[PDB]
Structures are given as structure tokens and as C-alpha cells.
Scaffold this active site. Structure first.
Site, mmCIF file in Angstrom:
data_model
loop_
_atom_site.group_PDB
_atom_site.id
_atom_site.type_symbol
_atom_site.label_atom_id
_atom_site.label_comp_id
_atom_site.label_asym_id
_atom_site.label_seq_id
_atom_site.Cartn_x
_atom_site.Cartn_y
_atom_site.Cartn_z
ATOM 1 N N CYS D 41 57.989 45.004 93.521
ATOM 2 C CA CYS D 41 56.608 45.032 93.182
ATOM 3 C C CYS D 41 55.881 45.550 94.400
ATOM 4 O O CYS D 41 56.247 45.269 95.551
ATOM 5 C CB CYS D 41 56.102 43.641 92.817
ATOM 6 S SG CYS D 41 54.371 43.632 92.262
ATOM 7 N N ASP D 43 53.158 44.561 95.393
ATOM 8 C CA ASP D 43 52.616 43.375 96.082
ATOM 9 C C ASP D 43 53.343 43.106 97.406
ATOM 10 O O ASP D 43 52.688 42.905 98.436
ATOM 11 C CB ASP D 43 52.681 42.130 95.162
ATOM 12 C CG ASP D 43 51.444 41.981 94.270
ATOM 13 O OD1 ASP D 43 50.339 42.259 94.789
ATOM 14 O OD2 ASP D 43 51.555 41.560 93.085
ATOM 15 N N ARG D 45 55.177 40.945 99.103
ATOM 16 C CA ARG D 45 54.662 39.835 99.843
ATOM 17 C C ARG D 45 55.646 39.609 100.964
ATOM 18 O O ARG D 45 55.244 39.340 102.082
ATOM 19 C CB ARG D 45 54.532 38.586 98.962
ATOM 20 C CG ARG D 45 53.787 38.762 97.648
ATOM 21 C CD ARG D 45 52.389 39.349 97.800
ATOM 22 N NE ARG D 45 51.557 38.594 98.740
ATOM 23 C CZ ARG D 45 51.046 37.380 98.516
ATOM 24 N NH1 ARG D 45 51.274 36.724 97.370
ATOM 25 N NH2 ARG D 45 50.300 36.803 99.461
ATOM 26 N N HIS D 97 58.712 38.301 91.763
ATOM 27 C CA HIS D 97 58.187 37.175 92.516
ATOM 28 C C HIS D 97 57.198 36.353 91.769
ATOM 29 O O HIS D 97 56.349 36.853 91.032
ATOM 30 C CB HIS D 97 57.541 37.599 93.815
ATOM 31 C CG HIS D 97 56.468 38.614 93.660
ATOM 32 N ND1 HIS D 97 55.223 38.464 94.226
ATOM 33 C CD2 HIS D 97 56.453 39.807 93.021
ATOM 34 C CE1 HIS D 97 54.483 39.522 93.941
ATOM 35 N NE2 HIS D 97 55.209 40.352 93.211
ATOM 36 N N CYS D 100 53.138 36.867 90.988
ATOM 37 C CA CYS D 100 52.953 38.319 90.938
ATOM 38 C C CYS D 100 51.593 38.606 90.324
ATOM 39 O O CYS D 100 51.346 38.276 89.157
ATOM 40 C CB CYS D 100 54.074 39.022 90.125
ATOM 41 S SG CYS D 100 53.780 40.801 89.912
#
Ligand code: ZN
Ligand code: ZN
Ligand code: ZN
Ligand code: ZN
Lengths: 215, 215, 215, 215
Positions: D41, D43, D45, D97, D100
Site C-alpha cells: 500500500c 500508505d 507505514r 495493513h 489501511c
């Protein structure tokens, strides 16, 4: 029919318009914004002009394999967005057909190469309506899968940001799901017509109902 | 022409085929693999069946905005791959048209929203042939940009892995670049016809030559 | 390094964070909207976190083959649109690299299959800057083609409806074009930084200038 | 952290490699084909290098919003095809995750614009597993929807012509579906690992089983 043939026929067709219909020319240049978008299959066994009777340039056209409207298909979406936001089409029509070669290839599932990826979008639907199809006779299944595919692309289309935002804006746009076969060339309205977000849901469900009701 | 109208006309059209041409039905079911792929514009001012004279189901069809063949457009590519590898079409035809609304929007460049991204593929071409267009009169430029766009999509198409691998395989497939206007409906072969990778290059260059020669 | 290995290392890495940096956990959950979007190559020879020093979740990431931003690539565009309109990133960075395997495959042009279609977007650029490259020594060409590719994706990106409409809206968003090689891991700002539609044009031209100036 | 900052940190980071790890440079240039593809993703993280321990250039990377593998996504597919057919990666990993942001936006469904179309691919899945989710507590639903999404993209991926043809060819390629949260950064193998077409089906079903078993 080879190439020299079509070039020759074209020239003669064009000359003979003078005596059949010169205005065919002048209807086009005046105006002509189309009022309808047609999304069809590239199979195009019967042309929408002939099916419907519409003059050309009352129509705006998209044709892909099995007349899909994939969520992320920028090609098809680009057609819709221009149609709805720029040409302000009043109606949009997704037309399937019984015997659709690509609906067929999704089911039988041969190794055809690149296209198989596109057809996975059809097998997804076929799965989604497994139970429904299970409760009906096998003779009726392929054709019902055509109807389901149209119906789902109608659902997809009304879910696009383009349609969502257009309906909320107050734009007057209606979606239809039709199908036909070459046995008669006769349209069957699948009853999924959607004039807004509320009717999209109602009539999606309504039509799935009538397949699950009749069978 | 509203919806009840097309449904009504369809029914009657379908009935009246019995007396005009019942075989219209039976030509379709036998065979009918098409021999030609047509890539056109969704504008579809004149339908390819009428332009060319071809019966339906001698044709297989893709229509997007300004008849583009983008390198990474899986929709259009999926049509081509099925057409070439599975239906074994003998010819492919990219047809543009003078007055193309999307060629126009690329140039004038209004804020139309999502479509503008698709049209950036046209402004790329217009740039690519800046000099060429510079050396000709402005009256002739828009229409020449139609011809260039077709010609470039013909070039793109022969560069696709699909076509590259088909030609190298020994498959017999020819690409054409046509255009027409609604002044007469008359086809103009742009002379970019490509029977292999060698002729794709020669004739790409040849045709760009003849625009840079005539002007 | 096999699978059981990474699973094992993960568990232990995660335990040992308690003593190295427990807050690594709590910096993430508070807040953490990222301020930067990074568009890179899937090659990912050096990770942007390490190059730049940024903590993770100051970053939002897209990685495709050769870090392209194609006009009609809904995947990459979807990342940008969310980033700019929803996360309100302040900066966007397109990072290339010398030795890029996909820039290389565009040039040498082997038959690799499906990917070759994606790489046609690179050969387009290489053509576009033929003259420019012609006027410099061959030793410097591949790497210059990396710089040109970044620069063009920066140009593409500022041309997207997403960026156009964001800049016109008054949103504060800046685009960068960087490159690095693994000889030193050192960033080179390509000088194409664009804070609006005017500066996108100026600096596109500026940077092409400095390649055509230095060579 | 502004731009001058990252440029400055980069320079210093690069200098200080000489004393921390000069070979970091020379491990990269020798060889280095990666053995793993990571689909994640945007994202991001926690970066896959840090999660897993892998050196960079043992990895090849794709990151889109919610780590989707859409049937017709030529961007993601182009990454996979190069990875599998050209770099001959041995493993592919789809990592989701918990928390998300895009899985979240699919569910809560705000009007975010263009991205909503991409997220329709998530709502499709959420529907597909309605019953399953219905039979578990609401507290566990969002996170389970992450696990389902990964699992479905693993299913999609093994269905791609690329993977189908690779497995049938005899190429040794394994697919994984992982997830992690930032509470601990700890990977959870979702048990969908697929070494061929048979195991793809078995383990797709197996894992859906264990969600429908545990709940
Ligand atoms: Zn069909
Ligand atoms: Zn047109
Ligand atoms: Zn690279
Ligand atoms: Zn996420």
C-alpha cells in the site's frame, strides 16, 4: 470483400447519397450533439443504428469485449465522462447479446492469452450469481449470464464518481440495460433503468429479483 | 426519439426483416468470424457498416474518444489481441474523421474534466509534428492533425507486443489508417498500410513525408 | 534469505524495537498524514526513507517500472489524487536512477513480453529528445535519458487534471524531479520544480535548456 | 522536514556511508537481481526493508492504494510480468495493513473524488464476504476486511495470465499474503501461499475457511 472492394463501394455509396439522401450530410453538421451513449460489445453482430432506428450522431459509442464497464477502466470512463458532462447525453445504454463470444470464453475458459485477464471480470460475476444460476436449468444459464453481466455493468456505471456526481448535481441522465439475440434481433429491456442513485439500487435488486423469481 | 420510441421501432424493424431479409438472421449464425477489426471514434458520425458496405459480423469494433491506441490501454489492446490471436482478423482499420470533437478539444484545450487527461495523448502528437504543421497554412492544420493522429495510432498499434509477435509468427495481418469527413462521407486512405514491421516503418515515414512534401 | 528467515527476523526486529525505539510505534499512530508523495521505480535500489532521512509516514509511495506518470494510468493517478486532494501532501517527488533496468530495456529493446508495451512510453521520450542527445557524447546518453524521463513525468504530472485543478484552486503543492546513482547514493535535483502551471512550463524548458546548454 | 533539509541529509548520509558501510554501494552493483517482489500500500507505514530485514535490491516493489492487483491494471501487471518473466523472482508478497486508509475509505465511503472508483474494487470484496463478516463481531470487521483484501489480491494475482502461464511453464514462483499493524509491526502470514494453480485454489479456500472457522 477485400480492401479495394470497400474503397470502391465507399466511393460509389458516397456518390449515390446525392439521390438517396443528400441531407444525410446536412443533418450531421446541424447540430449534432448526440442524446444517447451506447456501450456495446465489439462483436457488434447487429449495429445499434439498425437495432434502434436512430440516425447516426444521435449516438455516441463505446464498444469493448463483452461491453464491460470496469471500475478503473479509464478508456470507457473517459467516454462516459465526456458524454455525460460535455455532450450532456440524456440516456446511456449498455447492450449485451446472447451468444457473446467473450461471455462464452469466460465460462469455457480456454487459454487465449492477454484477453483472459479482461474476462476475469466476467468470471467474478458468474461467481457472484452462482446460487441464482444453480437454481435454474443449465440450458438457460449462459444467456442468463449475459443478462447478469449487462445488469452488473449498469450497476458499476451508476457507481462511478462520474454518475454519482452528475445525479447529485441535478443532471438528468438515465441508465438502461438491454440485451438481444440474432434469432430475431429483438431488444429485451432488463428492467435495471436508473434515473438516480436510489433507483439504481432499487432496480438492480428488482431485476436480480425477477431472475431469482422466475427461477 | 425517446426510449419507448426505439423499443417500438426495434420490434417493428425485427418483424419486417422477415420480408426484407430473413437471411440477415442466418448469415450471422453462419459463420461468422469477422475478417476486419475497426478502431474508431465514439463520435461515430458515420457507421463503418454504411461507409464500407460490410455486412455486420464481417466487423469487430472498438470505439474510444478520437480512436486512440495508447501503448498501455488494456481495453483497446484486449480488443486487438482477441481479434488478431483468436478471431484471426486479416485486416485492422483505424478510422479518424475531420471535425473530430476530441481532436478539437485537445487543441482548443478547455477545462472539460477527466477527459482532458485522455486528450493529452493528442497534444503530445500535435507537439511531435509542430514543425510540419508550421510549414503549412492554418486553414489546413486541424484536419492534418486528424490525419497525423490516425497515422500515429497506426504506428502505435504495429509497435504493440501483440502485433510485433503476430508478424514475427508469420500471421497475415495488415494495418490501415483511414479518415473521412461528413462533407461527402468519402474515405481517404492515409497510405500507412503495414503488412509487417518493415513496412510499418517505411510507410509511417512515407506518409509523414507526403504531408511534409505536399506542404 | 528465504521466507522462514524474514518471518523470524521480523519477529525479533519487532521485539527489539522496545529497546531501540518504542515511539517508532507511537509516532506512526500520531498523526500521521504524510507531507510528501514519492513516485519511484520498482527497482528501488535505495529506499526513499534512507536516501532522504524521512521517517516513514511522512511518506506516501508509488513505484512502477521506471517511475512513469502516464496520462491515462489510473493506478498512479489514483495515488496522486488521493495524495493531493485528501492527504493534502505539500510536495511530490519523482525520483529516477542511473542504471534503471527499464530505461535500459527501452533502449536496447529486447523481446521481454508484456512489459515492452509499458516501455514504449520511454522510447517516445528518447525520440522526442533525439537531437539533444545527438549533440552530446554517447557515454553520457543513457544517464541523460534517465534525467529526461524524470523531467517528462514531472511535466506529465503537472498536466494532469488533478494538478491543474489543484493549482487553480489555490492548493500549495510543489513538484520535483530528482535522480540518483548507486555509485554514491547522492540526489541530483533536476531543476524542474514546479509550484504552479506557469513554473511547470518555465522550469520544464529551463532544465531541457541546461542539458542543451551544458551539451 | 522541508526540501533543503532532505537534500542536506542526503549529502551527509551519503558521505557517512564510507564509515558505516562502503560495500552498501558494491553489494548493489553486484549482482543484484532481486529474488522477491513486494506489492504494498502507498500508505507504507513501515517500509518492507525494515519489516523483513532484506537488503535493498533483494526487493522489487509495487505500491498502490490498498495494495490491489486488479485484473486489468496494466501498471501493476507490468511490474509482475517483468518481475516473474525477466528478473525471475522466486517469491511475490502482497502485504496489507490494519488501519489501511483506503480500506477505510471504501467502507465509510466519503466523496473523495477520483479515488472512489479505485476503492469500488474493495467494496466488491466486502460484499463478496458479507455473510462471513456478519457472523463475527463488529470490532473485528475492519481488520478482517484487510485480511480478505490481501487474500483476494493473492487470488487475483495467481489468476493472471502471467502467473498461470509461468506455473504451467515450470517456473518456480510462490505467492504470499501477509498483513501487519503498527501496534507491534509484526507480520501475520495469512496462509494463502500458492506454489501453483492447485495450491492457489486450496489455500484461497483454506484461509477463508479459517476466518469462517475461528468465526
Ligand atoms: Zn460479444
Ligand atoms: Zn471524433
Ligand atoms: Zn529502475
Ligand atoms: Zn493503506
Amino acid at each position: 470483400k477485400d480492401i479495394d472492394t470497400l474503397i470502391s463501394n465507399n466511393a460509389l455509396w458516397s456518390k449515390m447519397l446525392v439521390e438517396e439522401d443528400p441531407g444525410f450530410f446536412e443533418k450531421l453538421a446541424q447540430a449534432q450533439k448526440p442524446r444517447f451513449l451506447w456501450i456495446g460489445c465489439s462483436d457488434s453482430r447487429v449495429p445499434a443504428e439498425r437495432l434502434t432506428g436512430l440516425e447516426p450522431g444521435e449516438l455516441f459509442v463505446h464498444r469493448n469485449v463483452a461491453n464491460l464497464v470496469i471500475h478503473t477502466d479509464l478508456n470507457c470512463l473517459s467516454v462516459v465522462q465526456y458524454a455525460v458532462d460535455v455532450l450532456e447525453v440524456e440516456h446511456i445504454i449498455i447492450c449485451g447479446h446472447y451468444g457473446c463470444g467473450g461471455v462464452q470464453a469466460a465460462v469455457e475458459n480456454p487459454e487465449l492469452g492477454l484477453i483472459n485477464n479482461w474476462l476475469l471480470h466476467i468470471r467474478d460475476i458468474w461467481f457472484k450469481h452462482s446460487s441464482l444460476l444453480g437454481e435454474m436449468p443449465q440450458e438457460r444459464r449462459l444467456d442468463t449470464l449475459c443478462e447478469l453481466n449487462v445488469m452488473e455493468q449498469v450497476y458499476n456505471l451508476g457507481h462511478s464518481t462520474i454518475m454519482q456526481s452528475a445525479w447529485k448535481r441535478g443532471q438528468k441522465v438515465t441508465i438502461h440495460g438491454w440485451a438481444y439475440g440474432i434469432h430475431d434481433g429483438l431488444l429485451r429491456d432488463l428492467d435495471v433503468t436508473a434515473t438516480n442513485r436510489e433507483t439504481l439500487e432499487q432496480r438492480y435488486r428488482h431485476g436480480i429479483s425477477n431472475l431469482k423469481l422466475k427461477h
